[PDB]
Amino acid sequence: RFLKVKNWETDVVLTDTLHLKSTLETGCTEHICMGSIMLPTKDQLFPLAKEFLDQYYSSIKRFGSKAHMDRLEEVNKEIESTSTYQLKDTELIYGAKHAWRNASRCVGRIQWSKLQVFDARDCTTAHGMFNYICNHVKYATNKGNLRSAITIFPQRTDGKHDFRVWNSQLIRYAGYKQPDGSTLGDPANVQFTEICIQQGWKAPRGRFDVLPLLLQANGNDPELFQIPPELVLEVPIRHPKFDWFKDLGLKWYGLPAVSNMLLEIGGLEFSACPFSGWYMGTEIGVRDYCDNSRYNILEEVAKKMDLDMRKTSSLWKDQALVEINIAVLYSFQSDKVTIVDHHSATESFIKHMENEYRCRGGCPADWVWIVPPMSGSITPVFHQEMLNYRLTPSFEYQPDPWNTHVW
Template sequence: MDEVKRRARRFLSDPALPGDRRVRVAQALRSLDEKGTYQLTGAELDHGLKMAWRNDPRCIRRGTYPTLRQLSWDGVVRMDVSRTELTAERVIAAVGTYLREATNGGRLKPMIMVFPPDTPEGPRLRIWNDQLIRYAGEARPDGSILGDPKHVDLTAALRRLGWAEPIGRQTVLPVAFQLHDGVPIWATLPKDDILEVRLTHPDFGWLREVDFVWHALPAISRMVVVVGGLVLPAIFSGWYVASEILENLHRFGVLHQFAERLGMDRRDRFLLNRIEPIAFDIIMHSFRSAGVMIEDPWAADANLHRFVEQEKSAGRVLCGDKSRLVLAGATPDMHARTDTYLPPDPDADPGFHYLPEAWAPLT
């Protein structure tokens, strides 16, 4: 409790917040003594969420943090959200609302949905999927993987919970979650809420036979936001950078399919150097022709550099995880490699915190 009080005092004393900060700090500390928690006002929560995104060491597009939009999961006033009880039905409905609102027909926008904060007794909500939309993966008898190799363990955990749908190359997994550390619950995402982009290009008609899609919305969901010592489960999304889609193509073996279609020698040690520019062109064309927002890595990297310089001029040095910020196809001057960052702060407040796998004991 002493640590929560320290964090609450520090955050609520921020002069960027409206009102008498000394009075507000006293109110919050009194509530912590009496109830073990306190409530953020709408202005405090909005400011805290934007600062958490600004502080996120993994996000290359955090320079747009002022545009972050909150999405109420239950229609209640934000300052009263901690008095609203979570149920499985409400969480499932909130996930559907988030998918529809954040996807916005392909016109993606930075958005976050926060749920009631954890209590002194433990977590309120934990979503198992690292993103709301993930593709299943299972090992075949011959040792090969059908579907996404990255999500074999999550698929196995969902099987243990009773999910029995046969899978193909790209079968969307249910979303699984726990309330109050209780029995895991899973729910199938409605197909109409999932926008997928099929790879197409006017110069490569064979893409119809490759038959590969990727979901438009990267909605991070195995995370919490810490604001003023309060731990709030959250869903957060912006839009993809093309290099992230490229990583998925590589994992599914699609780049080698491209190489075969283009008559390239798979033994060529420079194969990826030759095929990646073509893949970037295909990715950008596919998303743009489908009307789905996407960013090329050069623009994202330049945006990050501008943001770093902006923060420096304000006397701040950002935390940064360079393993996440150096993108494939980065700009020639490699801003993401040369910009100065502090090490990521595991206790950042306000801050985004990405959680470990919850299903490990079940697999």
């Protein structure tokens, strides 16, 4: 019932109690582990509300006060009458920060409490959503001293009045299927790059075309907008020692900003809540560039290094992978955009576990996601036992909207 986690490199043992608060279900049974699967009424709403406000008033050391009891009644009455309720700003900010704090797949949660929250519950139109989003992007980008931020559009009501940002991220490159059969640009975006063209986008058809935002307000048909180019900070990719690297013509964007998730706070569902921080180098260099069904450039790079590619045992793939990732970090640093390397990032996360275990009695964590996709065992998170469990408030996946919104 009280569970231990051992770090096998330091022998440090931490005891977890926070999991007993856990509410939702993981997918695992004690017959099957599902830890490596990517996706495994008014009646309900009040319990949910009460649990949230309970932890809120606990957090500001007012558990059991007049303020607390009063608020609990205020909400109870509001649900009774309206079938939903509205969050105070103070609760919204707390809710959002905690959804991040609770993201068991996020290695960067040591920053959770510095989240700038932009309240956009007064939004009503796609143009309104566009203006909110450009302000988010500009605030977040900060000319390269990147700043974490979330923007929260209005909560679900009947579920046919959804706000949704259709893009998966606010900034992404276009992917085009070719007569060739091969793929130009980002193949993970092919479908969407064609939902845009299908709604009127004039595609440049290049390697690195920044996609239009495609915004849905109040459950209406969605609309295209080009993010002002001057708001999209990009980094030319060069190597600190390899002259020919430049010539690959590689760039990436500075702002990672997840826009397709659903934020739940105290039973309320915020289906458009794009949030953003900054990159861990590997997310670009390992996955974006080298992944088979992504940009997949390893072959072309190994060649320029003139490595022996006749046998896997030369470790040429590995060799090239390191260089590509050296060059992502070097480029971002030289162009002064915030970026963290996986050594630094896993090292802070360890520190953040220590803190969460002593400050909160635990920290939910998904080992499969926390360990970098390169050099696992040389980052301290590899040797760290983690417990995974679902706390609220949370970010959750939700169906892609083109499959749902009846056009």
